[PDB]
């Protein structure tokens, strides 16, 4: 039983215990929440054990278990540098997501925990599978649990939201499936170790690129294909929102490393000016739009759109710096956007019952712990240094500028507007007068739970912001394998 298969098995045992413990003890709801939390903790503990044993400079997939009982659809698991940190981010985030809803579900708690635990197994399976069809099977398997999570525990407009996220993702994924099936037909197999060895013809690469890019653009999302995010990420329960923004957005980013950079390098090189136009447009249009967004979670949801454009531009830079920056920005956005949704969807929305920004003012006066963390998360969302958000933005933007300067400059302008919308929101909530006259009751400050799910998130971004080498050390050799090009005097040694 490989460590990687252990990762997928623990959350399934937790589901079993959650749904059977009543036959051994009316069981208290606190029991279910404790089973689910410990389950995610042991999954985090296993992912940390794997990371200690992980080797930073191996071109072999590590911790793979030999199957040799070949079938039509077999599940092979393996990990290298590009997948190791996405696996860690999934295992760190999900316990925080569980605590972020400890008190705010209050109904169908068994269903919420089983759905949350199942989502962990599926999302981890996405980052661990060593086959392109296996990748697709898990990328899509999460829609029905996502569809039912929003509908069971979402806000007032959760019906329109759940439909939007289901149908957008399916429609785009159906175009990715067509591209994937063409690959398996030509090659005979979708296993990574032998599909990357193959060489597709240019026009095949061109049509393979559109099919895959249409799906990755719905999931980034790119601007104009992002209606589903505006609805789903806001109407979802807080735990759903954290998982949706901090893990699910990353699948398309990790999928660019496994599905287009190795097999479609000519198409990627010849179409970067189209990816960059869409990437540049998304940086500006989203930034201007979130400046005028009045729902606090939708403002924070809309920020994810702007940052996802920056690491989408990085992965197509064909440079070592852009690709490392893209993973580091995708990781950084995972912590910071998780904290900002806890601040908005968890702290403000539980106190007031509303998310309109018009009703908030001067919260610093009564809530100095919320404002202290909120400001640090508003700095991190603005790409301020000593946050992992700056190291990722600077490396991602440097690659974008070097690959194509006109897009780099425009994507650079995000340094202004991210700051602009992040600080403007911060002032209309924490500063900007005395406590809002709409509040009749006074508000309490962060509970111990709220303090420690924020302190944990702001610790990860800051420590990684001062020493990003912890992550870059395990990306240097694997990131190198996805670069496409040669130097005049280093190529073809004899």
């Amino acid at each position: 039983m490989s460590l990687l298969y252990v990762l997928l098995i623990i959350p399934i045992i937790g589901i079993f215990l959650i749904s059977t413990i009543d036959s051994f003890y009316f069981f208290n709801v606190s029991y279910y929440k404790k089973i689910a939390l410990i389950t995610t903790i042991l999954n985090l503990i296993v992912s940390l054990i794997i990371y200690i044993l992980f080797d930073f400079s191996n071109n072999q997939f590590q911790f793979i278990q030999e199957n040799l009982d070949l079938s039509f659809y077999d599940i092979y698991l393996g990990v290298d540098g590009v997948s190791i940190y996405f696996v860690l981010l999934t295992t760190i985030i999900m316990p925080i997501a569980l605590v972020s809803n400890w008190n705010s579900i209050t109904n169908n708690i068994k269903s919420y925990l089983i759905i949350m635990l199942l989502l962990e197994t599926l999302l981890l399976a996405v980052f661990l599978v060593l086959d392109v069809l296996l990748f697709y099977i898990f990328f899509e398997s999460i829609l029905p649990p996502l569809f039912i999570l929003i509908g069971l525990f979402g806000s007032s407009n959760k019906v329109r939201a759940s439909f939007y996220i289901f149908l957008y993702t399916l429609l785009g994924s159906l175009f990715l499936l067509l591209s994937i099936l063409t690959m398996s037909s030509i090659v005979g197999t979708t296993y990574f170790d032998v599909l990357l060895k193959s060489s597709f013809e240019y026009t095949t690469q061109l049509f393979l690129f559109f099919g895959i890019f249409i799906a990755f653009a719905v999931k980034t999302p790119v601007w104009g294909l992002n209606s589903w995010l505006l609805r789903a990420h806001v109407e979802s329960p807080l735990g759903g929102s954290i998982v949706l923004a901090a893990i699910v957005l990353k699948l398309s980013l990790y999928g660019v490393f496994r599905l287009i950079l190795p097999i479609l390098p000519q198409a990627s090189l010849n179409l970067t000016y189209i990816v960059y136009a869409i990437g540049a447009i998304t940086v500006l249009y989203a930034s201007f739009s979130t400046l005028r967004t009045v729902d606090v979670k939708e403002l924070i949801a809309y920020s994810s759109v702007a940052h996802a454009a920056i690491y989408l531009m990085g992965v197509f830079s064909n440079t070592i710096q852009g690709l490392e920056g893209a993973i580091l920005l995708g990781l950084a956005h995972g912590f910071v956007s998780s904290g900002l949704f806890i601040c908005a969807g968890g702290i403000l929305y539980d106190r007031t019952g509303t998310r309109l920004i018009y009703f908030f003012r001067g919260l610093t006066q009564i809530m100095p712990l919320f404002s202290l963390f909120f400001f640090i998360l508003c700095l991190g969302n603005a790409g301020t240094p000593l946050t992992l958000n700056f190291v990722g933005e600077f490396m991602s933007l440097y690659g974008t500028l070097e690959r194509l300067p006109i897009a780099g400059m425009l994507a650079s302008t995000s340094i202004i507007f991210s700051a602009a919308y992040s600080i403007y929101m911060y002032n209309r909530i924490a500063f900007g007068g005395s406590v809002s006259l709409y509040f009749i009751d006074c508000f309490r400050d962060l509970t111990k739970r709220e303090f420690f799910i924020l302190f944990t998130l702001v610790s990860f971004t800051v420590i990684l912001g001062i020493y990003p080498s912890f992550v870059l050390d395990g990306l240097h050799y694997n990131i190198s394998s996805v670069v496409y090009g040669i130097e005049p005097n280093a190529s073809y040694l004899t």
Binding site: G224, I274, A280, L404, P405, I406, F443
Partner: protein
Amino acid sequence: MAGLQHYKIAMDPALVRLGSMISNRYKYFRWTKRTALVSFMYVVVVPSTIGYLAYKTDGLWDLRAKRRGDLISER
């Protein structure tokens, strides 16, 4: 109002009405001269302009280790 009891707010009817109008605004969009031009400016022209500049200047320069007597122009 929600599942978990919150504090008592002075829920202003005017602000509540404003936040509902925004959430429902998509149902009332119509194609007119104005709405067609704006939607054509943002979606087609400005993106196609950037795509033109990105396409035209892809590979035009390299800054790496450039010296005096050696240009930045690459094409």
